[PDB]
Write a protein that binds this ligand. Sequence first.
Ligand SMILES: NC[C@@H]1O[C@H](O[C@H]2[C@@H](O)[C@H](O[C@@H]3[C@@H](O)[C@H](N)C[C@H](N)[C@H]3O[C@H]3O[C@H](CO)[C@@H](O)[C@H](O)[C@H]3N)O[C@@H]2CO)[C@H](N)[C@@H](O)[C@@H]1O
Ligand SMILES: [Mg+2]
Ligand SMILES: [Mg+2]
Ligand SMILES: [Mg+2]
Ligand SMILES: [Mg+2]
Ligand SMILES: [Mg+2]
Ligand SMILES: [Mg+2]
Ligand SMILES: [Mg+2]
Ligand SMILES: [Mg+2]
Ligand SMILES: [Mg+2]
Ligand SMILES: [Mg+2]
Ligand SMILES: [Mg+2]
Ligand SMILES: [Mg+2]
Ligand SMILES: [Mg+2]
Ligand SMILES: [Mg+2]
Ligand SMILES: [Mg+2]
Ligand SMILES: [Mg+2]
Ligand SMILES: [Mg+2]
Ligand SMILES: [Mg+2]
Ligand SMILES: [Mg+2]
Ligand SMILES: [Mg+2]
Ligand SMILES: [Mg+2]
Ligand SMILES: [Mg+2]
Ligand SMILES: [Mg+2]
Ligand SMILES: [Mg+2]
Ligand SMILES: [Mg+2]
Ligand SMILES: [Mg+2]
Ligand SMILES: [Mg+2]
Ligand SMILES: [Mg+2]
Ligand SMILES: [Mg+2]
Ligand SMILES: [Mg+2]
Ligand SMILES: [Mg+2]
Ligand SMILES: [Mg+2]
Ligand SMILES: [Mg+2]
Ligand SMILES: [Mg+2]
Ligand SMILES: [Mg+2]
Ligand SMILES: [Mg+2]
Ligand SMILES: [Mg+2]
Ligand SMILES: [Mg+2]
Ligand SMILES: [Mg+2]
Ligand SMILES: [Mg+2]
Ligand SMILES: [Mg+2]
Ligand SMILES: [Mg+2]
Ligand SMILES: [Mg+2]
Ligand SMILES: [Mg+2]
Ligand SMILES: [Mg+2]
Ligand SMILES: [Mg+2]
Ligand SMILES: [Mg+2]
Ligand SMILES: [Mg+2]
Ligand SMILES: [Mg+2]
Ligand SMILES: [Mg+2]
Ligand SMILES: [Mg+2]
Ligand SMILES: [Mg+2]
Ligand SMILES: [Mg+2]
Ligand SMILES: [Mg+2]
Ligand SMILES: [Mg+2]
Ligand SMILES: [Mg+2]
Ligand SMILES: [Mg+2]
Ligand SMILES: [Mg+2]
Ligand SMILES: [Mg+2]
Ligand SMILES: [Mg+2]
Ligand SMILES: [Mg+2]
Ligand SMILES: [Mg+2]
Ligand SMILES: [Mg+2]
Ligand SMILES: [Mg+2]
Ligand SMILES: [Mg+2]
Ligand SMILES: [Mg+2]
Ligand SMILES: [Mg+2]
Ligand SMILES: [Mg+2]
Ligand SMILES: [Mg+2]
Ligand SMILES: [Mg+2]
Ligand SMILES: [Mg+2]
Ligand SMILES: [Mg+2]
Ligand SMILES: [Mg+2]
Ligand SMILES: [Mg+2]
Ligand SMILES: [Mg+2]
Ligand SMILES: [Mg+2]
Ligand SMILES: [Mg+2]
Ligand SMILES: [Mg+2]
Ligand SMILES: [Mg+2]
Ligand SMILES: [Mg+2]
Ligand SMILES: [Mg+2]
Ligand SMILES: [Mg+2]
Ligand SMILES: [Mg+2]
Ligand SMILES: [Mg+2]
Ligand SMILES: [Mg+2]
Ligand SMILES: [Mg+2]
Ligand SMILES: [Mg+2]
Ligand SMILES: [Mg+2]
Ligand SMILES: [Mg+2]
Ligand SMILES: [Mg+2]
Ligand SMILES: [Mg+2]
Ligand SMILES: [Mg+2]
Ligand SMILES: [Mg+2]
Ligand SMILES: [Mg+2]
Ligand SMILES: [Mg+2]
Ligand SMILES: [Mg+2]
Ligand SMILES: [Mg+2]
Ligand SMILES: [Mg+2]
Ligand SMILES: [Mg+2]
Ligand SMILES: [Mg+2]
Ligand SMILES: [Mg+2]
Ligand SMILES: [Mg+2]
Ligand SMILES: [Mg+2]
Ligand SMILES: [Mg+2]
Ligand SMILES: [Mg+2]
Ligand SMILES: [Mg+2]
Ligand SMILES: [Mg+2]
Ligand SMILES: [Mg+2]
Ligand SMILES: [Mg+2]
Ligand SMILES: [Mg+2]
Ligand SMILES: [Mg+2]
Ligand SMILES: [Mg+2]
Ligand SMILES: [Mg+2]
Ligand SMILES: [Mg+2]
Ligand SMILES: [Mg+2]
Ligand SMILES: [Mg+2]
Ligand SMILES: [Mg+2]
Ligand SMILES: [Mg+2]
Lengths: 49, 272
Amino acid sequence: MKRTWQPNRRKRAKTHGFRARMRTPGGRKVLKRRRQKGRWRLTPAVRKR
Amino acid sequence: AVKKFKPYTPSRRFMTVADFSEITKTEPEKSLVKPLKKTGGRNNQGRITVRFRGGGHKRLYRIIDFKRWDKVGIPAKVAAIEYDPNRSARIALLHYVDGEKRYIIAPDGLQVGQQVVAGPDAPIQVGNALPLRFIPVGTVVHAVELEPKKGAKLARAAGTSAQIQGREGDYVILRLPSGELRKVHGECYATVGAVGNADHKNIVLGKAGRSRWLGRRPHVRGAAMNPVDHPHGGGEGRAPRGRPPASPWGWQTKGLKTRKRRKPSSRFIIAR
RNA sequence: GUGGGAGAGGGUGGUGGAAUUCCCGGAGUAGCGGUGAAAUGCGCAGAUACCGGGAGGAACGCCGAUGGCGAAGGCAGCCACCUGGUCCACCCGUGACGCUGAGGCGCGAAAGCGUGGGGAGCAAACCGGAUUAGAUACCCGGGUAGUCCACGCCCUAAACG
RNA sequence: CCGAGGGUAGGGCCCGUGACUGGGGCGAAGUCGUAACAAGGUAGCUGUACCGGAAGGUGCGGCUGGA
RNA sequence: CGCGGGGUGGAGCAGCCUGGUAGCUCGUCGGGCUCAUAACCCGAAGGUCGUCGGUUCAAAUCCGGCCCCCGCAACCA
RNA sequence: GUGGUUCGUGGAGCCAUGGGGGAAUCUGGGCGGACCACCGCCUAAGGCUAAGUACUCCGGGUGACCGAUAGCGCACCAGUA
RNA sequence: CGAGCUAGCCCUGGCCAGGGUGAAGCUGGGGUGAGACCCAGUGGAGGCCCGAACCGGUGGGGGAUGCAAACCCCUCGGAUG
RNA sequence: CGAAUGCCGGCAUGAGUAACGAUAAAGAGGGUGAGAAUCCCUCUCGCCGUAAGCCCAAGGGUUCCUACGCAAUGGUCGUCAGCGUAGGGUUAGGCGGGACCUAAGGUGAAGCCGAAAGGCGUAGCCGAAGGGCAGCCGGUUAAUAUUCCGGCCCUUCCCGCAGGUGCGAUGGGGGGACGCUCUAGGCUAGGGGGACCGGAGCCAUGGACGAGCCCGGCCAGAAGCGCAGGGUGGGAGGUAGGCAAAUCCGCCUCCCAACAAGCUCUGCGUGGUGGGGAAGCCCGUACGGGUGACAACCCCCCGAAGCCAGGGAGCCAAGAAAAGCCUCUAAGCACAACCUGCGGGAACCCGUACCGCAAACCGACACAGGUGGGCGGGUGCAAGAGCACUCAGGCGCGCGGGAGAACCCUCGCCAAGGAACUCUGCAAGUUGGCCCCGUAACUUCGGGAGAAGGGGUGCUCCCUGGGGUGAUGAGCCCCGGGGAGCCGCAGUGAACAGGCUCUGGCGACUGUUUACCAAAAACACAGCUCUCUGCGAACUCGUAAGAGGAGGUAUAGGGAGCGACGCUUGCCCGGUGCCGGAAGGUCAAGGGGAGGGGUGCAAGCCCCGAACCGAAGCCCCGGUGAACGGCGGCCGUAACUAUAACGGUCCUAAGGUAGCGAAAUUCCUUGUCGGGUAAGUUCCGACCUGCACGAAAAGCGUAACGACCGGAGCGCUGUCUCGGCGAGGGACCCGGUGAAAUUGAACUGGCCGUGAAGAUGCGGCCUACCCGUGGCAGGACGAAAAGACCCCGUGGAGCUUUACUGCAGC
Ligand SMILES: NC[C@@H]1O[C@H](O[C@H]2[C@@H](O)[C@H](O[C@@H]3[C@@H](O)[C@H](N)C[C@H](N)[C@H]3O[C@H]3O[C@H](CO)[C@@H](O)[C@H](O)[C@H]3N)O[C@@H]2CO)[C@H](N)[C@@H](O)[C@@H]1O
Ligand SMILES: [Mg+2]
Ligand SMILES: [Mg+2]
Ligand SMILES: [Mg+2]
Ligand SMILES: [Mg+2]
Ligand SMILES: [Mg+2]
Ligand SMILES: [Mg+2]
Ligand SMILES: [Mg+2]
Ligand SMILES: [Mg+2]
Ligand SMILES: [Mg+2]
Ligand SMILES: [Mg+2]
Ligand SMILES: [Mg+2]
Ligand SMILES: [Mg+2]
Ligand SMILES: [Mg+2]
Ligand SMILES: [Mg+2]
Ligand SMILES: [Mg+2]
Ligand SMILES: [Mg+2]
Ligand SMILES: [Mg+2]
Ligand SMILES: [Mg+2]
Ligand SMILES: [Mg+2]
Ligand SMILES: [Mg+2]
Ligand SMILES: [Mg+2]
Ligand SMILES: [Mg+2]
Ligand SMILES: [Mg+2]
Ligand SMILES: [Mg+2]
Ligand SMILES: [Mg+2]
Ligand SMILES: [Mg+2]
Ligand SMILES: [Mg+2]
Ligand SMILES: [Mg+2]
Ligand SMILES: [Mg+2]
Ligand SMILES: [Mg+2]
Ligand SMILES: [Mg+2]
Ligand SMILES: [Mg+2]
Ligand SMILES: [Mg+2]
Ligand SMILES: [Mg+2]
Ligand SMILES: [Mg+2]
Ligand SMILES: [Mg+2]
Ligand SMILES: [Mg+2]
Ligand SMILES: [Mg+2]
Ligand SMILES: [Mg+2]
Ligand SMILES: [Mg+2]
Ligand SMILES: [Mg+2]
Ligand SMILES: [Mg+2]
Ligand SMILES: [Mg+2]
Ligand SMILES: [Mg+2]
Ligand SMILES: [Mg+2]
Ligand SMILES: [Mg+2]
Ligand SMILES: [Mg+2]
Ligand SMILES: [Mg+2]
Ligand SMILES: [Mg+2]
Ligand SMILES: [Mg+2]
Ligand SMILES: [Mg+2]
Ligand SMILES: [Mg+2]
Ligand SMILES: [Mg+2]
Ligand SMILES: [Mg+2]
Ligand SMILES: [Mg+2]
Ligand SMILES: [Mg+2]
Ligand SMILES: [Mg+2]
Ligand SMILES: [Mg+2]
Ligand SMILES: [Mg+2]
Ligand SMILES: [Mg+2]
Ligand SMILES: [Mg+2]
Ligand SMILES: [Mg+2]
Ligand SMILES: [Mg+2]
Ligand SMILES: [Mg+2]
Ligand SMILES: [Mg+2]
Ligand SMILES: [Mg+2]
Ligand SMILES: [Mg+2]
Ligand SMILES: [Mg+2]
Ligand SMILES: [Mg+2]
Ligand SMILES: [Mg+2]
Ligand SMILES: [Mg+2]
Ligand SMILES: [Mg+2]
Ligand SMILES: [Mg+2]
Ligand SMILES: [Mg+2]
Ligand SMILES: [Mg+2]
Ligand SMILES: [Mg+2]
Ligand SMILES: [Mg+2]
Ligand SMILES: [Mg+2]
Ligand SMILES: [Mg+2]
Ligand SMILES: [Mg+2]
Ligand SMILES: [Mg+2]
Ligand SMILES: [Mg+2]
Ligand SMILES: [Mg+2]
Ligand SMILES: [Mg+2]
Ligand SMILES: [Mg+2]
Ligand SMILES: [Mg+2]
Ligand SMILES: [Mg+2]
Ligand SMILES: [Mg+2]
Ligand SMILES: [Mg+2]
Ligand SMILES: [Mg+2]
Ligand SMILES: [Mg+2]
Ligand SMILES: [Mg+2]
Ligand SMILES: [Mg+2]
Ligand SMILES: [Mg+2]
Ligand SMILES: [Mg+2]
Ligand SMILES: [Mg+2]
Ligand SMILES: [Mg+2]
Ligand SMILES: [Mg+2]
Ligand SMILES: [Mg+2]
Ligand SMILES: [Mg+2]
Ligand SMILES: [Mg+2]
Ligand SMILES: [Mg+2]
Ligand SMILES: [Mg+2]
Ligand SMILES: [Mg+2]
Ligand SMILES: [Mg+2]
Ligand SMILES: [Mg+2]
Ligand SMILES: [Mg+2]
Ligand SMILES: [Mg+2]
Ligand SMILES: [Mg+2]
Ligand SMILES: [Mg+2]
Ligand SMILES: [Mg+2]
Ligand SMILES: [Mg+2]
Ligand SMILES: [Mg+2]
Ligand SMILES: [Mg+2]
Ligand SMILES: [Mg+2]
Ligand SMILES: [Mg+2]
Ligand SMILES: [Mg+2]
Ligand SMILES: [Mg+2]
């Protein structure tokens, strides 16, 4: 039947986006750590135009 | 009135509709004086505070005039009488001679063509509005104010009305659609007559949908749910509560009074 | 027809005083209610009795009759509008147009039923208190429908002269 | 083609029978009470309504076949 | 089988738990009123207390054994 | 009414303080564990002040520390696949 | 950290072949004092019926290291709400 | 290190076993090649064809196209590829988004709140398949085109000239601008027919040179018309409203229209012109090209769900906003500006390949699963997106060849009986579409109803009645009615297409639910009642601010229960609850201080502390059951027995009424009596001894409604006696690829004993050459899961109250 992953570019940047994470105190920390851990990608790689 | 139906479908037998004869060939509302976008929504910021709402026909707000000392002395002619989805009372639209249009909740009687007005002057006739003092003790009246300049608030439901009782200082005793004798200030307007369309209390919704149309989702009894989400809940084949009847949140609901005790509004009240 | 006459005939609107019950205040105590007698109950948490003030509903004392009106059932404070019947006089108009009335249609106390209002007093049922051998009764204190209004059904009667 | 009748299916009336049931009529000396007739010891009678072992009682209105 | 409750004049109930004292309503018997019966009035009679044991000076009453009676439990499989 | 102190209400002081009352300027105030006397110590309700002290992303040294299933997860283009 | 599955609400758009059945209201006639009402004709009402898409998930079989961590076949519910 | 269902890695085992992913299907000749069932070509055959065919969007991100290649990827092969290497490939003022607008909702100056982080928040900003807005038809490439080019037609800016007018706002108005079902008239898309036009061809096989067969007969295109159709009154006075101002808007009052007459605004035709252009045939493709061609480009009919569009009619639930657009004026400026023509000039940024109901998206896979929108031809069946065949177009689902066992899946058929099968007609059949007959109880007058039960249904000729498009006709297209006749076993001849009935229970009904074992008698539901709430409402979320409630106001809103409708809902307020009681009893801080205590030499300072005054709360006094609840026992009695209308006594707060009753409630129980039956622990009707119904956790009913749950008939039948035959896909044999749970090691026989009590393994005897293959499942206390029942642990959570102890809240 229908599954749980229904990709959607908008929803994805809108939710796990970078400006998205900067906006909140908890998300900013999410960035810190990922930066502090090394992670090549701080946030998901949404795309297209 | 109240239209009836032959049983050509169970439900549309007991079903009963209103009679919109009193509706002056109007229907399409009046831009300008209303309508405004009406933000429908069953909960506040986030959560749902009143339960069981949502869904139900889209609606446009008819921005009515609920404080008439706006036009003291300026007479206006009642133009139409139309339907208002936001209330039980039908409403009348009227053109002042000032050239301004505005709606008023329509009183029983008031016919299209009639002239109506407000102010200390104003003749005591259906439609006219005046400060409570200047109104004849005993006359009935609707659309009362509670405090000078704050707008109408009592007897505005379909065909409801309040009767003046006496005077007493800068105050005048009323008798609200509920039976409470209240002391209102003299300077509160109150347009004369009863609200009209009193057959409203007689409409037999009819089916399940009918309720759904007016935006009210099904209502489930506490008795149906479990202990986890309401007092009356569990365990075997139904049950008799098992304790003093209570609400989802738990306070008694078969008798417990609510008005907050030490309210300042107490002293101006006298009844039930 | 013309011209008048009496009447609680009918409907709808509006209003007036008497008394009851409750409410508030005054003042005022040790009992009031009720019966054949009492008991329940009511009262020092201020009763009963009295005065002032306010709400609400129902019913209209004297006139009032052994009277009147209505086809009947029935109709009783006052005012107004709409309305039917009914008698008198004048002997003008019509010109036999008259009577009864199977069915039909309509009205139709009361209780009762529907929906909505209203609810002072009364009061089926019902709770008490007496009475009795026992009382689901007659007697007493409570008291719900009902009683009253709108509209809709119900068509009964010792509807009797 | 029609057509006596034969088979199918569904209706209408009447007749008989049926556990138990409902009241009834009748049956010399069974039980409980005492409703009515004298003011029947609550005048009765009534239509309706609720109630009660039973008679019956009560309400609302009516009637004289009572005062 | 197990839990606890109960056997009292003819009927239905008290009386114990703080042992010595059996009480009430009805019914039954005798007498009255009435023509007579009921009602009502006046008096009177009747109880090995389920039984076999002992506990104490003394048991309806305290304690164990059986005879019926009533109610409650007989769950997980 | 509470916190801090070894201090959990204890005879419970001191140091801080939300609440209410509400001063004094040296013959003025706080403390020495209820309180009082005596004898003493200090001078609150404004602020700053290096040094010794902590830490190791980075650089260096040295190991009765590992030696590729160990040693950091990674000796290798790993915080990758 | 998650309402891209799922539940609910909000704003905004989209979708439902083709058949049945015949509501009220109209129009004519009948009726009466005027009515109630009765007939026709029109009319197209409905949490209306049949039934595709679509939305489901009744009964049985198969599938059960599957085609599939919810499947398939037969059948069945609803489908202007 | 020998064990931890231990950790990591490696390799065995089952095993050449099961599988190789749809039962829509393949056969052959000819190329290429080291190697072809699998690649390329051709011929033949089968599948889809409201798609398995085309077009978008989302997602995907190089998968598109060429050349060169098979190591691996492909469930086999592979020269093929969605694969590996390389290069090429996406072109926009008009399509889509943005330098336009606004909705929910974000964000957010002013402000408001919160220990901080942070929370709210009218303006404004953001915010999109919603509003606004300017491109159609063809051609070319190996790959892109509404993008390039070709033809025709537009949009804005900016700059000039020609003039018109007081121009002029982020401000005022107008408009933009709206529901649902049903529809009118005219159109186009789409389709059918053609004796007419235009076409390579073709006379087969017995007949046919024929109005013969086959193939095709348009597309776009401004102004100008013409045909539809939408919008709209025109003047003038007065004007206090439209938050400054208006000449505009509104509101009055006099004239003229009421008509679409007249302006406009779209759709449709017609249109200068531009372009396309079948079959067959020749070729060479991996495909396209050439000819057919000066191709024709004609007339009728069907016909939209689309267009005119802001069309109309009806209805109740009463149906976005802002901007563009017009209009109106203000500060300002009126040598500005703005409006109308004509020219020139200027016009950025992003997307375009390809997949796209799928091998390129979501499912670890080239996964029978899922995935919004548009097109979806023809014939026939009453209609239809249905069904069957088929256009166009695309597939034969990436392992094959045999054989023709059991058994499995799926499918067909049956003698005679027919439910005897069985928990149960479960499953399977029967019926089946349309038309016309003809339809019962009961009923809430609708219904039940497709009741039930029947006949008709194909072709041929003859006669005859309607329409519609055309003129009142021909044709073409729809409905008909009658009458003769013909052929079959059979005429909705193939596909799609109810089995029917009686009866009871349960619930009113449509609806809802346990995604993934429960679709119900559960939930919801209109309706019924109680109760709270006067408005800064009650109530709920939040610490607050604030928000919902509600821009609502007692015919309104919150809670609770019952659950349409009919008939009805009895007694108990003693307890618990809530409601009412300005009296009393008790009651904390505090107020009050009689009095006592510690120090001082004293003033003092410092502690205790009885009266008394002190709230709610409880106690106390009443109301109240559609509030929490409850609603008896033991005797006796009637002139046959029997039974008890009557009585007696005890305890209650009061002593369950009507109605129902062996029940969804009944233990004893298959109670007992009746019915159905050959026989009936079920069913149905009765009785009442109701273990243990009973009145809003409602009582007894009720037409209708049901994938609910029993009982019964008729019909039909492989369910069965009791099986048999047949088909296909596996099973089996061959080639290719080739797993898995499990596994102390194995050289793993029967009885009878014994053993921790169920022995291949010990004892005694009996039996038994070695190794495979198909099968059956009794055993290996067979696999699977540290048993989910149970008990244990002073283990864990979920839930309740008059458990304890707090907290919110009041
Ligand atoms: N025909 C009698 C009807 O029924 C009732 O009457 C019936 C009863 O009331 C009546 O019962 C009477 C009773 O009143 C009286 N107090 C006691 C008497 N023993 C009974 O008598 C009855 O029973 C006996 C035998 O048992 C018979 O022989 C006698 O005839 C009979 N009437 O017996 C009658 C039937 O037999 C009505 N009261 C009466 O109005 C009506 O007419
Ligand atoms: Mg607006
Ligand atoms: Mg919130
Ligand atoms: Mg938020
Ligand atoms: Mg009502
Ligand atoms: Mg509910
Ligand atoms: Mg539940
Ligand atoms: Mg929850
Ligand atoms: Mg709870
Ligand atoms: Mg239960
Ligand atoms: Mg409960
Ligand atoms: Mg009279
Ligand atoms: Mg004369
Ligand atoms: Mg007559
Ligand atoms: Mg009457
Ligand atoms: Mg009456
Ligand atoms: Mg009374
Ligand atoms: Mg007596
Ligand atoms: Mg009385
Ligand atoms: Mg009989
Ligand atoms: Mg006697
Ligand atoms: Mg008597
Ligand atoms: Mg009497
Ligand atoms: Mg009577
Ligand atoms: Mg268990
Ligand atoms: Mg502390
Ligand atoms: Mg100090
Ligand atoms: Mg010190
Ligand atoms: Mg010291
Ligand atoms: Mg420092
Ligand atoms: Mg080493
Ligand atoms: Mg090594
Ligand atoms: Mg390592
Ligand atoms: Mg009609
Ligand atoms: Mg229809
Ligand atoms: Mg429907
Ligand atoms: Mg359907
Ligand atoms: Mg070991
Ligand atoms: Mg093999
Ligand atoms: Mg094997
Ligand atoms: Mg095998
Ligand atoms: Mg195999
Ligand atoms: Mg395959
Ligand atoms: Mg690649
Ligand atoms: Mg190649
Ligand atoms: Mg391979
Ligand atoms: Mg090769
Ligand atoms: Mg390719
Ligand atoms: Mg490649
Ligand atoms: Mg924008
Ligand atoms: Mg907004
Ligand atoms: Mg915010
Ligand atoms: Mg905002
Ligand atoms: Mg904006
Ligand atoms: Mg857009
Ligand atoms: Mg555009
Ligand atoms: Mg292409
Ligand atoms: Mg403007
Ligand atoms: Mg505007
Ligand atoms: Mg089509
Ligand atoms: Mg030939
Ligand atoms: Mg054209
Ligand atoms: Mg102005
Ligand atoms: Mg060509
Ligand atoms: Mg319209
Ligand atoms: Mg804006
Ligand atoms: Mg201007
Ligand atoms: Mg730019
Ligand atoms: Mg493309
Ligand atoms: Mg699609
Ligand atoms: Mg695969
Ligand atoms: Mg494949
Ligand atoms: Mg797939
Ligand atoms: Mg789909
Ligand atoms: Mg068809
Ligand atoms: Mg199909
Ligand atoms: Mg057979
Ligand atoms: Mg046969
Ligand atoms: Mg059988
Ligand atoms: Mg058998
Ligand atoms: Mg059965
Ligand atoms: Mg079946
Ligand atoms: Mg049934
Ligand atoms: Mg149901
Ligand atoms: Mg489930
Ligand atoms: Mg579901
Ligand atoms: Mg608010
Ligand atoms: Mg609001
Ligand atoms: Mg309510
Ligand atoms: Mg319930
Ligand atoms: Mg229920
Ligand atoms: Mg009750
Ligand atoms: Mg009580
Ligand atoms: Mg009680
Ligand atoms: Mg009480
Ligand atoms: Mg109280
Ligand atoms: Mg107190
Ligand atoms: Mg029974
Ligand atoms: Mg039997
Ligand atoms: Mg039998
Ligand atoms: Mg029972
Ligand atoms: Mg029950
Ligand atoms: Mg109940
Ligand atoms: Mg019920
Ligand atoms: Mg259903
Ligand atoms: Mg269902
Ligand atoms: Mg059935
Ligand atoms: Mg049978
Ligand atoms: Mg047969
Ligand atoms: Mg078989
Ligand atoms: Mg086979
Ligand atoms: Mg053995
Ligand atoms: Mg052995
Ligand atoms: Mg051995
Ligand atoms: Mg096997
Ligand atoms: Mg096992
Ligand atoms: Mg275990
Ligand atoms: Mg323990
Ligand atoms: Mg937990």
